[PDB]
Design a protein around this ligand. Structure first.
Ligand SMILES: O=c1cc(O)n([C@@H]2O[C@H](COP(=O)(O)O)[C@@H](O)[C@H]2O)c(=O)[nH]1
Ligand SMILES: O=c1cc(O)n([C@@H]2O[C@H](COP(=O)(O)O)[C@@H](O)[C@H]2O)c(=O)[nH]1
Lengths: 212, 212
């Protein structure tokens, strides 16, 4: 798009003090911080509250259960200051709707995964990815996760999604295409930022390369 | 089957001490304790070590990410005394293989989800459930999660699985069929045990009803 785009740090380290260090030093160059289970299991879910004072936090919990337990997971995420949560579309509309319902209580957002950026995502997810877009839209999801590693599919997802927010992982370690910026609203980068000698410099340079 | 079957407590409460009280109370009647994110996020991942002193612990983390992240999550589960982990087959063979590889380091087991017992599981998972069985078997998974709520499909899954271990949730709150015992090696029950006035009595009576 023509509009301002985000750089989102996937803070996949396994020490909370290290996470805080990295977030603080790259803060000038990143718009939101995505936290996944390796960090939350290592540091405690409370790490999201601490990180949220630096940038808004996406709870990347890949919620993928029946509605009852999915509801509880979403609630815990929002109780711990997450601005948004990530849910798998493949587990069905009932879970999508319930996670969206919990989110609304908190003014939070829900992102539905279409297909993973890894090769494994092609085995089952790719076949239903566009249908997931449809279901996520109908369920009231606020956005989508879609892969930079399959640019032709990312374009197709954008066409099906309209102006729905799309966040794209895969650039850097997974060798995704920087052309993803044409279709994405936010670019997610983990290793390309934190697994470096100078994370702040890498984040700075990524913005330049992506032209965002 | 003709062999001894397990009753597995899905301990989906959100206080560690409460979990320990319930686990101790029902220990005489249950064979393993399944722990999911509502408890682990609430009490800390260390609750698995405490629970493992009562019965072996299945880390029901619905692992559903790219291999890199999935590997880290599996490792953390096993470092915290889990005897096994649960992974979604839907995310692909690369993640299945990696989670199995981590499990082998610890002598742990991996169960692959075929299709969720909730209605949403019919939307996308049902259509590829049998292929997931094939991929899980090929990847080296030690078992499957399959639904008591769709008994005809459970039968098909058992036939495709050969002698892979199958654990079946859905009995009690989700109104799954007790005929699942015929195909399952273990029966998972959450609310039917813990959401009651007398969990030990409910677990005792469940064994009789299931004839296990
Ligand atoms: O399709 C997806 C969806 C994701 O959330 N992710 C997540 O985005 C991050 C990518 O990190 P990295 O840039 O180091 O490859 C990880 O946290 C991963 O779990 C992904 O890689 N592919
Ligand atoms: O297909 C599945 C797979 C599951 O792991 N589960 C899990 O099994 C447990 C079922 O609990 P309950 O008996 O209260 O319905 C929950 O922890 C749930 O996440 C399920 O219900 N269906």
């Amino acid at each position: 798009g023509s509009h301002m785009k985000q750089l989102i740090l996937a803070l996949d380290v396994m020490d909370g003090e290290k996470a805080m260090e990295i977030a603080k030093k790259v803060a000038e160059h990143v718009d939101r911080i995505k936290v996944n289970y390796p960090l939350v299991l290592s540091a405690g879910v409370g790490i999201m509250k601490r990180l949220s004072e630096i940038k808004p936090v996406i709870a990347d919990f890949k919620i993928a259960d029946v509605p009852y337990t999915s509801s509880l997971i979403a609630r815990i995420a929002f109780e711990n200051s997450a601005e948004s949560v990530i849910v798998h579309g493949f587990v069905g509309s009932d879970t999508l709707r319930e996670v969206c319902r919990v989110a609304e209580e908190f003014g939070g957002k829900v992102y539905a995964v279409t297909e993973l950026s890894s090769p494994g995502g092609e085995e089952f997810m790719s076949a239903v990815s566009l249908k997931i877009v449809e279901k996520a839209k109908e369920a009231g999801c606020h956005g989508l996760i879609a892969p930079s590693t399959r640019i032709e599919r990312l374009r197709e997802i954008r066409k099906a999604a309209g102006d729905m927010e799309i966040l794209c992982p895969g650039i850097g370690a997974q060798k995704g295409s920087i052309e993803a910026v044409k279709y994405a609203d936010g670019i997610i980068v983990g290793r390309g930022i934190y697994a470096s000698g100078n994370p702040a410099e890498e984040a700075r340079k990524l913005r330049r390369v992506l032209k965002i």
